[PDB]
């Protein structure tokens, strides 16, 4: 189906027994009433395309995913900056992604790093991908920055932004943003279930970054992560959320102060 649909010429009917406009909705099915079994239409050939509305063209946008700060002070400094990789931090890509239950794709992370007031000095950075189970680096001159059996990218600030391709690395067959269950066994409390809905097969390690130098660098960088989806497959479509997001890794909403799905009108018998 490279185009939308064509309409065949129709005419009028005056006879009993054939009722196409009485599709019962109690059956759970969608009404299959076409134009040709209704008001008299003409012959039109439609050449409008359906290529843009596909999933692969709908999820091939980058969007912002994470913002990582790097203070690099002089007396209360940290040096490194870890950031756990998750996409449920910015409600735009999350709202676009949470209209399905199970997804599977590849990523094209792009890292854009700038300075506080805005400037690009030729300082060399080091982006490190720490998988789950590998030790996290503690310090700007730690032992973990040797990057042996560990992927890393060396790029400067004046260079174009780096861009690496990340495969599908979940231990299960697909991703899922809705896990109605519990990660452990035993007795579960009733007051505060901080373990309910915790997606087990979604953790993907921690992203790290430091500045390659000896002493220090009096600068405050701020890098942004842009993740593009590709080779994506979606299952079990879910309705789109109509409530404002409130938490990072828990779908919640305000019990009072509920937002309606539509705006208000003056009267029901008025279209304006």
């Amino acid at each position: 189906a490279e185009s939308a649909a064509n309409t065949t010429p129709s005419s009028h009917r005056l006879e009993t027994g054939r009722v196409p406009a009485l599709q019962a909705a109690e059956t759970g099915a969608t009404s299959n009433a076409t134009d040709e079994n209704m008001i008299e239409t003409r012959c039109v050939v439609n050449r409008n395309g359906v290529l843009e509305t596909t999933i692969n063209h709908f999820f091939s946008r980058s969007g912002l995913v994470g913002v990582v700060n790097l203070t690099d002070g002089g007396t209360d400094t940290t040096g490194y900056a870890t950031w756990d990789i998750d996409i449920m931090g910015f409600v735009q890509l999350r709202r676009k992604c949470e209209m399905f239950t199970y997804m599977r794709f590849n990523a094209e992370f792009t890292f854009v790093t700038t300075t506080k007031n805005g400037e690009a000095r030729p300082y060399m950075l080091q982006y490190m991908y720490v998988p789950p189970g590998a030790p996290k680096p503690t310090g700007r001159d730690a032992f973990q920055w040797q990057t042996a059996t560990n992927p890393s990218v060396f790029v400067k600030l004046t260079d174009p932004p780096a861009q690496v391709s990340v495969p599908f690395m979940s231990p299960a067959s697909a991703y899922q943003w809705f896990y109605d269950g519990y990660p452990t066994f035993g007795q579960h409390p009733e007051t505060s279930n901080t373990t309910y809905g915790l997606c087990p097969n979604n953790m993907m390690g921690t992203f790290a970054v430091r500045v390659v130098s000896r002493e220090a660098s009096q600068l405050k960088l701020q890098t942004r992560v842009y993740m593009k989806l590709k080779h994506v497959r979606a299952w079990v479509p879910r309705p789109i959320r109509s409530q404002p997001y409130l938490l990072k890794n828990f779908p919640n909403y305000d019990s009072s102060k509920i937002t309606n799905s539509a705006r208000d009108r003056s009267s029901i018998k008025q279209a304006n």
């Binding site: 019962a24 809705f178 409390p189 279930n193 079990v236 109509s242 828990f250 919640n252 909403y253 799905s261």
Partner: protein, 246 residues
């Protein structure tokens, strides 16, 4: 020739007089796990009779100020019968389900219900606190209601932040008291893993929400219950060990 039906599974049978056609979820029948998609090595067990039958839950009176109810299907019949006993001893589980919701009334009552399944139906906490120490989370009887069931607080947002109006994308069916008095949905095994524990993870959940209120004149009957039966089609179990409770 279509408003009558007799569903027989095992040693149970469900007869009806006013019914619509059965709803088959996503066009897929429940089938056994193929050897290509499997990942375990131990041979799974298949009782095929004692765990494949219509288990009837309790009935709930549908008043005028009712909001709705929901269940978790690999948790409701998790303590009742051979299915529950077989699911407490094993670690892996895979099955489909056949659904049937009864709600009859006279030809003078009015109202309509919406019965549908929601895969991965995660319950949302209700509150306006963003601190991790006071953020409200649902309890265990709210997440896993058991064989009894749980009620809704804000059924307009499905108690999940998702609007009820768009919930027609799920496999659904209506119970309109002027058209029929029962609704039937057959659902296959929907998961991103071949086998999964039937205790620490509910696959999906049934929901009954009256959108059109129940109305009747003074003098008619006033007890209108909602009865639900569940058939675990094509059950498989693996990883045999000691029996756990929860």
């Amino acid at each position: 020739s279509d408003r009558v039906a007799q569903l027989t599974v095992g040693n149970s049978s469900i007869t009806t007089q006013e019914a619509a056609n059965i709803v088959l979820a996503y066009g897929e029948w429940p089938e056994y796990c193929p050897d290509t998609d499997a990942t375990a090595v131990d041979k799974p067990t298949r009782p095929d009779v004692s765990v494949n039958r219509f288990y009837t839950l309790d009935s709930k009176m549908w008043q005028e100020n009712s909001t709705g109810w929901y269940w978790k299907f690999p948790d409701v019949l998790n303590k009742t019968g051979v299915f529950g006993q077989n699911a407490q001893f094993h670690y892996l589980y895979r099955s489909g389900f056949c659904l049937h919701v009864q709600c009859n009334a006279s030809k003078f009552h009015q109202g309509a219900l919406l019965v549908a399944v929601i895969p991965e139906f995660v319950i949302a906490g209700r509150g306006s606190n963003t601190k991790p120490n006071e953020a409200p989370h649902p309890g265990f009887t709210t997440t896993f209601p058991g064989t009894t069931g749980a009620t809704f607080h804000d059924p307009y947002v499905l108690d999940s932040g998702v609007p009820l109006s768009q919930a027609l994308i799920y496999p659904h069916q209506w119970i309109n008291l002027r058209t029929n008095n029962c609704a039937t949905v057959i659902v296959p095994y929907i998961n991103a893993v071949p086998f999964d524990s039937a205790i620490n993870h509910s696959n999906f959940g049934l929901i009954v929400i009256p959108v059109s209120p129940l109305k009747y004149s003074s003098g008619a009957t006033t007890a209108i219950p909602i009865t639900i039966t569940i058939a675990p089609l094509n059950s498989e179990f693996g990883g045999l060990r000691q029996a756990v409770s929860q």
